[PDB]
Design goal:
homopentamer; alpha+beta; Acetylcholine Binding Protein, Chain: A; Methane Monooxygenase Hydroxylase, Chain G, domain 1; 2 domains; 7-stranded mixed sheet; 4-stranded antiparallel sheet; rod-shaped; binds diundecyl phosphatidyl choline; binds chloride ion; binds sodium ion; ion transport (chains A, B, C, D, E)
Chain lengths: 311, 311, 311, 311, 311
């Protein structure tokens, strides 16, 4: 089999559609997600045309091997998609209706800057390479683009599944490629992060601030250091959940800034003790009394500034 | 091969049955489980009919390629099922009896709200897409739906395996699709969670309450902070075991509430020390004495409340 | 190809044999193990009979596709076995000698009650489904059942590999099934658990009991809490190694009971301090002196009871 | 099919090109990366030559099985590449133009000496084995070597993708082989390591130095020991991120040297206490006062020497 | 196709050779390694013989399906090798020269007794089973056994790749099996273990010994218990790197023995405090003074004994 010939010099229009059946495995570290969907292809092959009155059959059904099917591939897949042809139907005028069910691991980058209050636009790129005989061009049949209502992605809210109707036609290795952009819009469900990471992290910090109502250096040292470790435990836990970035993330900024607070609290605790030993507890008392107000305020204002910069 | 033609205008009824041989790999985080079962299919194809007298056989055995077999797929599978045809039998009246043994990774959401005292309904959705020639509809042959007695799912009690007899018929890309719902009812074996997570977590909490019978700030600080840390160790362990959720879980609520108890115990320990230093140990004594009763009671009442809200 | 015909009304006897080449990957959490073995099959197909005079050769060699082969499957495999036909030999009378080399992940439950002093019986179930023409029945050729001397399973002692000679014939989905039980007997190598988990865990426990020869509440609180924490560290480690169970395990019982010891040691340490503060160190001295003897004994006695209940 | 025959005694020149579509999964521990690219091959096969006049076609398309294709393999792949033929075009002189899309896991060693400030040269080796008929030699068509602009590798900056134009021709198992070296130049994005590992690690060390402004042995012991533990937590985190090497890495050297600082700080803390107990706090005061300056300087100096040796 | 017939009653000699292209993924816990190599097979088939002068062609090239190839398998592979035939060449005399490129996961046990100063002998066993017609016997063509210079195995030094020239001929399931032993000799690169595990572990132990120059029970309890904890962290870390063994390993012995040192240090710290409280600090002073010398010596002597027993 060879491609359908052009009537006039026109490129072949392959109408495409992706219908999500399942979405799963959004790997933050790998910046990948798995998808199970219908891929619909539609193109006119005049060689396949027939008479409905005399043939008595409105639609003719073919096996993939029997006819010419355009070689459609995904740009951003890890391995080539696992596909199973559902149906091939030919209308009397020779319009072909291809339908396959596929599953693929899609590689699409994520912006972690606003984590865990981030939204993402996942991409699925369809592509066709033009043949020497004729040029192939992709189009979106919006009728055949959608998703099942039950499509869920654990820890995410699925906003929309749409296609950018205008293909990106360009030359690659002295031939035309026609690229389509399917978009899955999702927003992270930040709920869990509040009682699991954010609040426990704030409690340990506040516990270290009780050192401002204590004169016991040994006690204070213990408070600050111990709380500090725990901060370390949470900080590390996050790095694991997260992917390394060449930029700062929201949570990353909060976590880093909290380290400075522990460092300064240690300084205060050290200073207060030094003065007490040097028999000048009145200076020490002033610093400790200032610290009781300053820390919460600065910590609080600093957070405000950060949230402003990030949102 | 093409589908059996309709006598009158009727849709084709494909009788289905799933018999579980093996159940395994219930991944809580992935919300998936693996299954190994028999899939039985039965439909009438008049073109295949014969006379037992003329033929000298009361049954006819075909190879998949030889006859028309309905394209049955699973909706909620990760990848398309691994299937091996066991047998295809034809009765003299053109009644086809298809049997395959398959294995598949089924994606079915879980409700973690009552963890680890939760029960789940796992779903296996069978589907058939109608062809241009005729409409296909699924039915349940309850005689061919079951499970082996030895079917086990590690850390779960297998309640039942049943099918919702009435299919969910609907349009998808202008073709009728017949969807069937097979249900595997399971309930979690919470036993382990008592000596592994629940009791150790209560012991560390109770140990922090011994600070209410001590005047040593340094000793008290150590008691609360250390225990808090251990609680942190346990709190983190759970999140690894359990998926991030946009709702609170039972264990999650208990764990979060316990953080508040440590926070308040630190406040009490701080308050008691402050008064002792300000040469007013009679006030301190009252608060500490109140704390000894108040803590256990409030803790206990709060759990009662939570259990009420969750069950 | 169809099944061979009966010469009287008899069922077809398929003689089986499994010879283990390799056993590996015993996953305790998954309750699975991987196996690499020879599967030998023998049945008689009179339709394949030949005169060595005419054919030239005393034994004929066929390709699987060329002749009828009984559909033998494994019941308890995760996915269908990876098999490669080593040889298919036919003797003049039509006796077929089938040899394949396969590899499979077998799902077989484990009893953790006596961990790490447990022994297991791993099962490999062979099965055949009878056809409408004739009934198929499995048999064990004990001459072809065995294992290589070099067969090892990391962290386990391989006791025996035997077959239960009598098949389990039963009806399933209105057809007969002939099931065979191959057994791999193994016992855990508990050696490692002594210097890795058991002894370090006892040392930390005994370190806490040194609080019985101290009057320093602050030092005691450190000893008991710190050591307690370490126990926690070990406790979790086990849980990672082990599977959640609906029953208590030996190690699990020891670990849980040790928590009670820390809890009571904290009580003693609290009690002793309270009395010392209430200016009654003679009562405190009696309790501490009793504790020095009571603890080891009770701990010791308790272990005895536990070992008795478990073995 | 057999190889094209030599006109004169010349070896067959196969022109090659690799165009990266996707690069992902750079595993530091495994020293591997996954790639998805176009592989282009071009050679002259006179047997396939045709006259455009009598044929009426400027090009001819063939199925892989129909013609002779040189057996090109990758040297450094884990498993043989997953390839799909995109197009095979024959020009009138019999110049074959082959194009496949492949995906492969490439094994290429990494130099960790400058981690996380290291750059790497990833290699992809193309190879062809010469046949008994004629010698096969590889060449680079620089017009067909490149990468998509959107090619990204998480946590790395992609510098260049080039080919060493001159093949490495040599003998292997008594046949000549033509080897080509494709190079992917990348440099690590060290950004993250600063707020995640480097800075937290410096803060904990500096906190240990507050012991130089304290006379409380118990507070100092706690300060150093605790901080030391945190370092330990960070040290372990790294060796998990980072592969074991037979050489020292930059971060590894910093981490190891920091251990010496804790060890010496413990000695100082011990010495200072010993003197204080021996009723000679003037000596102790001198050592502590020296330590306040010495540590930062030595630490600071030590780093310069290290950074110098490593860069 | 059937096997080549014997001229005289001789068994068929299949000359073998394995040439390592790549060696990777040495999994200590799994006791496996992955290999990518050339497998060469050479045997003589008189049915395939031809005339050089008459034919004009020195060598004839066949497709695997066209001729008889001996069924060579690997004994110790997890799954059957992924093989791709590179070339089949027939000499006039009928000597066939087969060459495939394969990749396989080899299961070969490891001796951890001297870890991390251990050397291993990895095995690759080639096997052939005889047919009813004639007996097949393997031989090593040392000219075709080797490895690429660039073959590396992360964290290991590759010593040699050799073959035991004489096969192990034996009967299994009433047929001859000819087994060959290919050996990959490797020695572990212990460098990393010194600054990563060994030295940090010694530093924490020396820090515990500073308790011998302190009279502060509270400080000593902290020193010994904390450091002890750190030791635990390292001990556990090692357990993750290593596999459970039925024997003691070198590192395992060092780690276990170090626990005894902490246990005895706690006893000393307890004893010293008890005497101080009983108003007898002169006895306490003697024990502490003895301990300072004794611990290093015994620690040092015991280590010597251990190294002697292990090497
Ligand atoms: C520790 C200190 C507190 C950190 C909390 C940060 C929350 C925040 O500030 O984030 C705000 C986000 C929503 O932002 P968005 O939907 O992306 O808006 C983007 C549109 N702009 C660019 C116009 C703004 O979260 C929430 O709605 C609820 C957060 C409750 C957190 C409770 C603690
Ligand atoms: C921390 C404090 C202890 C927490 C214990 C909570 C357990 C609970 O109270 O949960 C309740 C569940 C059972 O619920 P169900 O079978 O879903 O009942 C459904 C019927 N309704 C809807 C009417 C309620 O647990 C148990 O059967 C055994 C509890 C043993 C726990 C020992 C500790
Ligand atoms: C923590 C406290 C110590 C725990 C050690 C329990 C050992 C035990 O009691 O286990 C006993 C098991 C043997 O059991 P079996 O082979 O299944 O006997 C089955 C036959 N019956 C049913 C008649 C009993 O181990 C051993 O052979 C030696 C154990 C050495 C452990 C050293 C410490
Ligand atoms: C812990 C103590 C401080 C550690 C910082 C080491 C950084 C370094 O010194 O590393 C050097 C690298 C760049 O190296 P390069 O691009 O490979 O240069 C190779 C070319 N030569 C041969 C001419 C040298 O860092 C940076 O560009 C920015 C580092 C910011 C770190 C801030 C803290
Ligand atoms: C913790 C306490 C220190 C432990 C150090 C163990 C070293 C050892 O004792 O091991 C010795 C091994 C070599 O052994 P081999 O080559 O296998 O000898 C086989 C030949 N025979 C049979 C004759 C013995 O290491 C080394 O060459 C360098 C050791 C540097 C370690 C730095 C610390
Ligand atoms: Cl694709
Ligand atoms: Cl399916
Ligand atoms: Cl099977
Ligand atoms: Cl390849
Ligand atoms: Cl093999
Ligand atoms: Na302390």
């Amino acid at each position: 089999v060879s491609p359908p010939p052009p009537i006039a010099d026109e490129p072949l229009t392959v109408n495409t559609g992706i219908y999500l059946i399942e979405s799963y495995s959004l790997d933050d570290c790998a910046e990948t997600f798995k998808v199970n969907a219908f891929l619909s292809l539609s193109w006119k092959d005049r060689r396949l045309a027939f008479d409905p009155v005399r043939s008595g059959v409105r639609v003719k059904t073919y096996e993939p091997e029997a006819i010419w099917i355009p070689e459609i591939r995904f740009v951003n897949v890890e391995n080539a998609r696992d596909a199973d042809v559902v149906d091939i139907s030919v209308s009397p005028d020779g319009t072909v209706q291809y339908l396959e069910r596929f599953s693929a691991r899609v590689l699409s980058p994520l912006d972690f800057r606003r984590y865990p209050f981030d939204s993402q636009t996942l991409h699925i790129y369809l592509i066709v390479r033009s043949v020497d005989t004729r040029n192939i061009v992709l189009a979106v049949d919006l009728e055949k683009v959608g998703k099942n209502d039950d499509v869920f992605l654990t820890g995410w809210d699925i906003e929309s599944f749409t296609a950018v109707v205008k293909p990106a036609n360009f030359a690659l290795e002295d031939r035309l490629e026609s690229k389509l952009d399917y978009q899955l819009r999702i927003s992270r469900q930040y709920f869990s992060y509040i009682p699991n990471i954010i609040l426990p992290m704030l409690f340990i910090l506040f516990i270290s601030w009780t050192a401002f109502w204590s004169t016991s250096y040994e006690a204070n040292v213990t408070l600050v250091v111990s709380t500090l470790i725990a901060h370390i435990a949470f900080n590390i836990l996050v790095e694991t959940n997260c992917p390394k970035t060449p930029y700062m993330t929201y949570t990353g900024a909060i976590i880093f800034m909290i380290y400075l607070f522990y460092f300064v609290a240690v300084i205060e605790v050290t200073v207060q003790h030094y003065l007490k030993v040097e028999s000048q507890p009145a200076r020490a008392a002033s610093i400790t009394r200032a610290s009781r107000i300053a820390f919460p305020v600065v910590f609080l204002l600093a957070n405000i500034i950060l949230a402003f910069l990030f949102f």
